[PDB]
Amino acid sequence: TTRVLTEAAVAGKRDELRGLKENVIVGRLIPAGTGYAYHQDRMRRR
Partner 1 sequence: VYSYTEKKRIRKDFGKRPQVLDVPYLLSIQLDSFQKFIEQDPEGQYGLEAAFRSVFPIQSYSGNSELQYVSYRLGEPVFDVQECQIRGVTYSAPLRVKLRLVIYEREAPEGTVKDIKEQEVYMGEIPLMTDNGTFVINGTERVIVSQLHRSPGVFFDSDKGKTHSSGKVLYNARIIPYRGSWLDFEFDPKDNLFVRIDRRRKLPATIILRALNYTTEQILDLFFEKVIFEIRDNKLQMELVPERLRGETASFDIEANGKVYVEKGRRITARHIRQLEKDDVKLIEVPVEYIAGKVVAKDYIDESTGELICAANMELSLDLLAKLSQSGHKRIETLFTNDLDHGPYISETLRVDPTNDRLSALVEIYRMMRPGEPPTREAAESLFENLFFSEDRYDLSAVGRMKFNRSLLREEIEGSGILSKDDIIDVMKKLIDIRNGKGEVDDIDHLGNRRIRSVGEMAENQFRVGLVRVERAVKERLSLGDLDTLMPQDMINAKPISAAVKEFFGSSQLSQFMDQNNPLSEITHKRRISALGPGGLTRERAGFEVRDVHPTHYGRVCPIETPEGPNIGLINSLSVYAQTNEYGFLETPYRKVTDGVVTDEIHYLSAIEEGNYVIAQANSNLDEEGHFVEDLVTCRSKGESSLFSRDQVDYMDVSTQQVVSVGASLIPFLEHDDANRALMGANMQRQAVPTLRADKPLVGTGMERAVAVDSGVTAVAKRGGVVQYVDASRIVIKVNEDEMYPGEAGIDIYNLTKYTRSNQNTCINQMPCVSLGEPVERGDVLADGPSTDLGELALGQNMRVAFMPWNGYNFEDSILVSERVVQEDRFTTIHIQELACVSRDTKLGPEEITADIPNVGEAALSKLDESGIVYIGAEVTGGDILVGKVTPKVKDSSLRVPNGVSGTVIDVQVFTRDGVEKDKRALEIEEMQLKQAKKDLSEELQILEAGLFSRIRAVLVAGGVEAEKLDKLPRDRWLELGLTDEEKQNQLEQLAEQYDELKHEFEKKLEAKRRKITQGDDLAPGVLKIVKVYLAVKRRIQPGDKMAGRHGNKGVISKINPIEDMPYDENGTPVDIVLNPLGVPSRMNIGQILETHLGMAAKGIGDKINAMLKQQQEVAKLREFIQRAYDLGADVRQKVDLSTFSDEEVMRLAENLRKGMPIATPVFDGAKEAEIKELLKLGDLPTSGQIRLYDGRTGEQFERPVTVGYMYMLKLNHLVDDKMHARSTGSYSLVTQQPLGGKAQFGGQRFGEMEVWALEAYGAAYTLQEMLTVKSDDVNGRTKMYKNIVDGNHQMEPGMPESFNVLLKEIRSLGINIELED
Partner 2 sequence: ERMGHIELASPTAHIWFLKSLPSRIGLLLDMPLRDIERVLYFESYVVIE
Partner 3 sequence: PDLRPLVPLDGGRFATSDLNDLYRRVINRNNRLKRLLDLAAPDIIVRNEKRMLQEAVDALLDLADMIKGKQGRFRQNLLGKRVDYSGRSVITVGPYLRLHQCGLPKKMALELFKPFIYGKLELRGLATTIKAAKKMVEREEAVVWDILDEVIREHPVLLNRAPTLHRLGIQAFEPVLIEGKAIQLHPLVCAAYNADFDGDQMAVHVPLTLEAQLEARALMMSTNNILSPANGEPIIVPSQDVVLGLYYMTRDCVNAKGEGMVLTGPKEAERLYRSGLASLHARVKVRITEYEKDANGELVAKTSLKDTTVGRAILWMIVPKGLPYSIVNQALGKKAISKMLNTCYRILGLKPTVIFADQIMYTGFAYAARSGASVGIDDMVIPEKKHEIISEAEAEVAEIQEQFQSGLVTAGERYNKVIDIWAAANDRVSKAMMDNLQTETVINRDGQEEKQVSFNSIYMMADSGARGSAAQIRQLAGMRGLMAKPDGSIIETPITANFREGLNVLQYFISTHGARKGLADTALKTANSGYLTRRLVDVAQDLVVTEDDCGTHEGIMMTPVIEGGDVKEPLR
Binding mask 17-46 for partner 3 (x = CB under 8 A): -xxxx--xx-----xxxx-x----------
- Residue placing its CB nearer to partner 2 in the complex, 27 or 33: 27
Residues in region 24-43 near partner 1 by CB under 8 A: 24-30, 32-36
Measuring CA to CA, how many Å separate 38 from each of 18, 19, 27, 29, 33?
13, 15, 15, 8, 10
For residue 16, the minimal CB distance to partner 1 (Å) is 11
CA 35 to chain centre: 13
Residues 6+ apart with CB under 8 A from 43: none
Binding site for partner 1 (CB under 8 A): 5, 9, 14, 20, 24-30, 32-36
